[PDB]
Amino acid sequence: SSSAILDLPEPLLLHILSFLTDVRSRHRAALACGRMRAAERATRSELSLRGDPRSPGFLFLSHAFRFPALEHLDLSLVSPWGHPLLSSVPPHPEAISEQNAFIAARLAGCFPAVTSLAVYCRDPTTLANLTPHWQASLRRVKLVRWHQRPPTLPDGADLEPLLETCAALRELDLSEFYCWTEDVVRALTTHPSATAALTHLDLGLAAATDGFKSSELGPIAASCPNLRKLVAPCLFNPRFSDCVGDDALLSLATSCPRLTVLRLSEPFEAAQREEAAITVAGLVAFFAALPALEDFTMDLQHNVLEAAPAMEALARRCPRIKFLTLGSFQGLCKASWLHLDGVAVCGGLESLYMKNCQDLTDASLAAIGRGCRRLAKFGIHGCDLVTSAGIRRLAFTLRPTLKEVTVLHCRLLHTAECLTALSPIRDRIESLEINCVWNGSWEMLRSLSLWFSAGQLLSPLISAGLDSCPVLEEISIKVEGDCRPAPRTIFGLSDLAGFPVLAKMKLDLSEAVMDLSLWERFYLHGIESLQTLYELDYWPPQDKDVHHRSLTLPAVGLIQRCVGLRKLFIHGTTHEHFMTFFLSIPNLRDMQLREDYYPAPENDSWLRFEVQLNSRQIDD
Amino acid sequence: KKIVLKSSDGESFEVEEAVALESQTIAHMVNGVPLPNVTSKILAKVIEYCKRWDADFMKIDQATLFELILAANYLNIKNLLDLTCQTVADMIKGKTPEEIRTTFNIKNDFTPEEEEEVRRENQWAFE
């Protein structure tokens, strides 16, 4: 007779809808009936805004488009992608100001309770126009800018509007925000009232920096006594006297004694045997000063020699250490003595990633297996002494807990032998990352990441060991090298057709190098044979000279036949004339050109395609 | 010490005081506890849950699920309420609007223009 779900007290229907996290499902639920629409709108916790909020279509939506509980608002993907949003800079000063105030007021109308904001941010007047409505509640701000820093702005001006007005601010995410290190130093050292309260800081700066110097990191830390999480790229090259050494690390630890997450990395060019200015004794003193540390990354190109006693200190002084990533630390585990040594002493480790440890052996892995009995995730990168015998033993010892494995650029670990060596956890492994080197199901494998050299084929992967993957839902494929093959030779994407639930693909050719057309054809051929492919992220290759990364016509022709695609994101550009071809994908909904690499092209028609895309009667 | 609970059918249940404390409605009650809103069939399932996977415990028909939601809410057992409500959300996930309607026996109360209004609103969020 009646509906039991609709006979529930409305607060319980809301409680049900609060557990539905898949967006498409939330949208379908809102279409079921009036009562579920109301429950969906009332409980949505996050939203990534799609389209142009400057348009009449957005500004004159009804009172019913209202999300009272929404906490996370992502504005960084509004159309046109990467354009200034609510900027005061002329591209009549009172007409701009009035239209900006109206858009901001409407955003606050739709999203009253925002505590977390992501925004594409071309200049600081964007922030000055968005903050006043949410300044009481705004706890977390993420800034995105792949474009150039506007040359005329004073030092620190990008961050000023946040620091002057947002008293609830605790977390600042600049991982994908291109600015200068000087900007960060100037802002964060001259705003003590904002800065004293910060708990989280990501300073990635779109990975387009040589790294923070000692004279920059010292003052930032000094101004941020409350930091719990710091992610930063640093200058570690001892040829520069302002590099980060023992003294700078110790200043960091004593200025930020509450740190639980600390991830420091050295940015590198391809154009490495020299030692860092970091010593074992220095790290011992450093770990002693960080008793609350749980998550530690130090990913260097420069070497820290004989690192075992520092790892022993880490275990003693940081008893809650769980997640550990180390790059160019040598002698992490020698397995040369009766007692367990180095990293094998850290009993609490739940993840361990070791890069460029040149004396890590099979004996080291055996020791790590016994010492680190909680290891759920394990990775080696550029560890050239490790053999399949070592991997096999490790996988066997860690059978109760080991769920994620990464093996990359290890000379004695070719793909066939590596996949065979993982046989003890083949039924349990959930995630695998490997680079492919050429000469009974993967029952729990949900996620697969592959690295290739240019021109290398994918096909041999199936017979090398990955032929049955019944729950594999996502694959990431990255191609490195210089492109600058027989004409019926193809990469072999269609050999992934035997995977029954493969829905999501990342195909990244950005570093793979007319001629580019034939390469796109080589890589994309057979993509239509992936019958359950639902979401594609495609990064076209760079041409050495030109600023754009073009999706060529052969690539368009190939992607067009992917009948199941719901979501298509192209990390580059294509001709306007190629756009209509994508409309013939019957249920395609989300499509965007995202030039999210530095420096992003300054764009001088997408909006009309976007209306064509929204006008089709696609499935709900 | 063991405490006695009465269902709507009349029948009585003897439970440990640690078990009954899981219901904050029971904890507030300061011979034994009458619960006129909970049937014996459903109270037995509540008691079974309150012994401290539950994926197995959720292998029940739709009517029992919704009665268990009502009971978990009348009693104040946050964890059971969460589990039962998550299970309904999993039933909604992956279904078309018609399949949602069919599963829960929901009547479409939308005008054709209201339906298009919802659809147009949905377009402002990425999936």
- Partner-chain residue, chosen from A31, A64, A614, that has the shortest CB–CB distance to B123: A614
Angle (CA) A343 A344 A350, round 5° = 80
Q: Which residues pair with A116 in a beta bridge?
A: A72, A140
SS3 B88: helix
The helix (run of H) or strand (run of E) holding residue A171 is strand A171-177
Retrieve residue B81's tokens. Answer: 């309420």
What ranges do the domains of chain B cover? 1-127
Q: What is the C-alpha to C-alpha distance for residues B50 and B40, in angstroms, rounded to an integer? A: 15
Structure method: X-ray
- Does the bond joining A80 to the residue before it have cis omega, within 30 degrees of 0? yes
Identity of the amino acid at A249:
L
- Cβ density class B68-107: b for 16+ within 10 Å, e for less: bbbbbbbbebeebbebbbbbbbebbbebebeebbebbebe
Q: Does any CB of chain B come closer than 8 Å to the CB of residue A30?
A: yes
Retrieve residue B108's tokens. Answer: 């479409």
Do B66 and A5 count as a contact with CB atoms less than 8 A apart? yes
The minimum CA-CA distance between B66 and chain A, rounded to whole Å, is 7
Q: Which position has the token pair 């009766």? A: A338
Q: What is the C-alpha to C-alpha distance for residues A510 and A594, in angstroms, rounded to an integer? A: 13
User: Length of chain B, please?
Assistant: 127
User: CB of A192 within 8 A of CB of A220?
Assistant: no
Q: What is the C-alpha to C-alpha distance for residues B10 and A438, in angstroms, rounded to an integer? A: 73
User: CB of A380 within 8 A of CB of A354?
Assistant: yes
Q: What region, left, alpha or beta, does residue B94 occupy, with left being phi > 0 and alpha being psi -120 to 50 degrees?
A: left
H helix runs in chain B, sequence order = 17-20, 24-28, 40-49, 54-57, 62-74, 78-92, 97-104, 112-122
Cβ atoms within 10 Å of A97's Cβ, excluding its own = 12
Do A36 and B106 count as a contact with CB atoms less than 8 A apart? yes
Q: Does any CB of chain A come closer than 8 Å to the CB of residue B111?
A: no
Q: What is the C-alpha to C-alpha distance for residues A199 and A170, in angstroms, rounded to an integer? A: 5
Q: What region, left, alpha or beta, does residue A481 occupy, with left being phi > 0 and alpha being psi -120 to 50 degrees?
A: left
| Residue A351, phi then psi, degrees to nearest 5 | -145, 140
Q: What is the C-alpha to C-alpha distance for residues A575 and A65, in angstroms, rounded to an integer? A: 35
The helix (run of H) or strand (run of E) holding residue A16 is helix A10-17
Q: What is the C-alpha to C-alpha distance for residues A538 and A552, in angstroms, rounded to an integer? A: 12
CATH class of B1-127: alpha beta
Q: What is the C-alpha to C-alpha distance for residues B93 and A22, in angstroms, rounded to an integer? A: 7
What ranges do the domains of chain A cover? 1-36, 461-620
Angle (CA) A54 A55 A56, round 5° = 125
Q: What is the C-alpha to C-alpha distance for residues A175 and A265, in angstroms, rounded to an integer? A: 13
- Partner-chain residue, chosen from B70, B108, B125, that has the shortest CB–CB distance to A47: B125
Residue to mutate among B93, B98, B105, with most A CBs inside 10 A, is B93
User: CB of A530 within 8 A of CB of A505?
Assistant: yes
Q: Does any CB of chain B come closer than 8 Å to the CB of residue A58?
A: yes
Domain A461-620 bears CATH identifier 3.40.50? no
Q: What is the C-alpha to C-alpha distance for residues A300 and A272, in angstroms, rounded to an integer? A: 10
User: CB of A444 within 8 A of CB of A471?
Assistant: yes
Q: What region, left, alpha or beta, does residue A211 occupy, with left being phi > 0 and alpha being psi -120 to 50 degrees?
A: left
Q: What is the C-alpha to C-alpha distance for residues B8 and B12, in angstroms, rounded to an integer? A: 10
Dihedral sign computed on CA atoms, order A99, A103, A105, A109: positive
Maximum Cα–Cα distance across chain A:
80
User: CB of A197 within 8 A of CB of A169?
Assistant: yes
- Cβ density class A468-507: b for 16+ within 10 Å, e for less: bbebbbbbbbbbeeebeeeeeebbbbbbbeebeebbbbbb
Nearest partner of A213 among A189, A188, A186, A241, judged by Cα: A241
Q: What is the C-alpha to C-alpha distance for residues A573 and A369, in angstroms, rounded to an integer? A: 47
Which 3-state string (H, E, C) describes A45-87? CEEEECCCCCCHHHHCCCCCCCCCCCCEEECCCCCCCCCCCCC
| Residue A618, phi then psi, degrees to nearest 5 | -90, 160
Q: The sheet that has B12-16: what strands, in order across it?
A: B12-16, B2-6, B33-34
Q: Does any CB of chain B come closer than 8 Å to the CB of residue A24?
A: yes
Q: Does any CB of chain A come closer than 8 Å to the CB of residue B41?
A: no
Q: What region, left, alpha or beta, does residue A20 occupy, with left being phi > 0 and alpha being psi -120 to 50 degrees?
A: beta
With beta carbons under 8 A apart, name residues in chain B contacting A588: none
Q: What is the C-alpha to C-alpha distance for residues A468 and A232, in angstroms, rounded to an integer? A: 40
Which 3-state string (H, E, C) describes A282-314? HHHHHHHCCCCCCEEEEEEEEEECCCHHHHHHH
Q: What is the C-alpha to C-alpha distance for residues A265 and A276, in angstroms, rounded to an integer? A: 12
- Does the bond joining A586 to the residue before it have cis omega, within 30 degrees of 0? no
Q: What is the C-alpha to C-alpha distance for residues B59 and A560, in angstroms, rounded to an integer? A: 42
With beta carbons under 8 A apart, name residues in chain A contacting B92: 16, 20, 25, 28-29
